[PDB]
Write an enzyme that holds these catalytic residues in place. Structure first.
Site, short mmCIF file in Angstrom:
data_model
loop_
_atom_site.label_atom_id
_atom_site.label_comp_id
_atom_site.label_asym_id
_atom_site.label_seq_id
_atom_site.Cartn_x
_atom_site.Cartn_y
_atom_site.Cartn_z
CG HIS A 1 37.33 46.38 45.61
ND1 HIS A 1 37.29 46.38 46.90
CD2 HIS A 1 38.33 45.98 45.40
CE1 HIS A 1 38.55 46.04 47.33
NE2 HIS A 1 39.11 45.63 46.47
CD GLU A 2 38.80 44.59 41.29
OE1 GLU A 2 39.97 45.07 41.23
OE2 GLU A 2 38.49 43.57 42.37
CD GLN B 1 44.03 44.33 43.38
OE1 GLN B 1 43.17 43.81 42.68
NE2 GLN B 1 43.82 43.90 44.87
CB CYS C 1 41.42 44.57 49.38
SG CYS C 1 42.28 45.11 48.07
CG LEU C 2 43.02 39.60 45.91
CD1 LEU C 2 43.30 39.23 44.29
CD2 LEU C 2 42.71 37.99 46.52
CG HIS D 1 42.26 48.01 43.40
ND1 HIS D 1 42.98 48.52 44.37
CD2 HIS D 1 41.68 46.72 43.75
CE1 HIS D 1 43.10 47.49 45.57
NE2 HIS D 1 41.97 46.58 45.09
N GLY E 1 37.56 39.30 41.87
CA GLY E 1 37.96 40.27 40.88
C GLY E 1 39.43 40.86 41.06
O1 LIG Z 1 38.30 36.34 47.77
C1 LIG Z 1 38.08 37.15 48.27
C2 LIG Z 1 39.26 38.22 48.49
S1 LIG Z 1 39.25 39.84 48.04
C3 LIG Z 1 38.36 40.19 46.44
O2 LIG Z 1 38.13 39.21 45.95
C4 LIG Z 1 38.61 41.49 46.02
C5 LIG Z 1 37.35 41.94 45.25
C6 LIG Z 1 35.82 42.39 46.01
C7 LIG Z 1 35.43 41.50 47.16
C8 LIG Z 1 34.17 41.98 47.68
C9 LIG Z 1 33.69 43.24 47.21
C10 LIG Z 1 34.13 43.84 46.30
C11 LIG Z 1 35.39 43.34 45.79
C12 LIG Z 1 39.78 41.57 45.17
C13 LIG Z 1 40.58 42.62 44.99
F1 LIG Z 1 41.06 43.33 46.09
F2 LIG Z 1 41.62 41.95 44.40
F3 LIG Z 1 40.00 43.55 44.19
C14 LIG Z 1 36.46 37.52 48.77
C15 LIG Z 1 36.19 38.52 49.71
C16 LIG Z 1 34.83 38.63 50.25
C17 LIG Z 1 33.82 38.10 49.35
C18 LIG Z 1 34.28 37.07 48.61
C19 LIG Z 1 35.54 36.81 48.27
ZN LIG Z 2 41.01 44.97 46.10
#
Ligand SMILES: O=C(CSC(=O)[C@H](Cc1ccccc1)CC(F)(F)F)c1ccccc1
Ligand SMILES: [Zn+2]
Ligand SMILES: O=C(CSC(=O)[C@H](Cc1ccccc1)CC(F)(F)F)c1ccccc1
Ligand SMILES: [Zn+2]
Lengths: 152, 151
Positions: free
Chosen positions: A138-139, A54, A96-97, A142, A49
């Protein structure tokens, strides 16, 4: 496609309420380009996401794209509104990125009903369950100036 | 596309805007951002604009002097940096799309400015007078400063 630089915790762009996409911006090459750059940036960072803030863009545009995690077609959401959160809760590890090497457990609603505009400007309402639901939450966080670390 | 403009009071205008990366140079994304900023500036009768004013926290500005003043072609500057301010000052009437109050503001009469073009060419130039005020105003937007804070 362009891969865009990503803001990190400590940068105050993440702490604002992002502005809604106006009517004139719907179905515009400006909006399609923004979404394509977000999408490319999300893929290049292996995120599931992404939110415009971001990438330093204080506009209400997110992408929800669960993939290995269950797999969905990616959905771009313009001015998304969560109309209902379930009272049922699920806990799970989030990242989170914008918060490199920091993970934690966040209680999220297990189902959300969300109303949003496509890039063309059509209104859609969709119910999300489980992991996709956590991503939506989560988004939308943000877009409202909230990082996940504030909900641990 | 005419973009909505942030007003004084909104925090987006107080941030330090982030530099445009190498990947964005000469991309359809960047050209589209600049086109939309340019159209917004025109619809609001401005002679400049900075990306933060359209909710984009990136170091892009346009300087587009015209009468009501020298007529110039609109110049888009990516990651501009003022290398030098003259100690000679000059006062002029400014307005801002984000403060829809005018005011008399003291500026350096001359500035030497480095920036990148949309295509990624690194360029350096000097501005005098009103275009130099416009440059100083817009770079101030990139560093979270409104002209009313200089009065
Ligand atoms: O690739 C990521 C890195 S973070 C990520 O994908 C966030 C999205 C997210 C991850 C887990 C739960 C809810 C949202 C993105 C953000 F920060 F850009 F929104 C990931 C993390 C946990 C599980 C699977 C993949
Ligand atoms: Zn995030
Ligand atoms: O339309 C305006 C109002 S404001 C304007 O054009 C600002 C630019 C400016 C005008 C005058 C002096 C310095 C900067 C734009 C801003 F806020 F986006 F940067 C105007 C004011 C003076 C001369 C000509 C036109
Ligand atoms: Zn201004």
């Amino acid at each position: 496609s362009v891969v865009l630089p990503v803001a990190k915790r400590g940068e105050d762009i993440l702490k604002l309420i992002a502005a809604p996409v106006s009517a004139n911006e719907l179905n515009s090459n400006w909006l399609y380009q923004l979404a394509d750059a977000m999408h490319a940036t999300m893929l290049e960072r292996n995120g599931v996401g992404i939110a415009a803030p971001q990438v330093y863009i204080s506009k209400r545009v997110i992408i929800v794209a669960s993939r290995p995690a269950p797999e969905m077609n990616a959905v771009v959401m313009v001015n998304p509104e969560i109309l209902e959160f379930s009272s049922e809760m699920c806990l799970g590890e989030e990242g989170c990125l914008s918060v490199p090497d920091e993970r934690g457990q966040v209680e999220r609603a297990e189902m959300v009903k969300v109303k949003y505009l496509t890039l063309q400007g059509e209104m859609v309402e969709t119910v999300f369950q489980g992991f996709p639901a956590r991503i939506v939450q989560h988004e939308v966080d943000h877009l409202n100036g909230i990082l996940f670390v504030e909900r641990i």
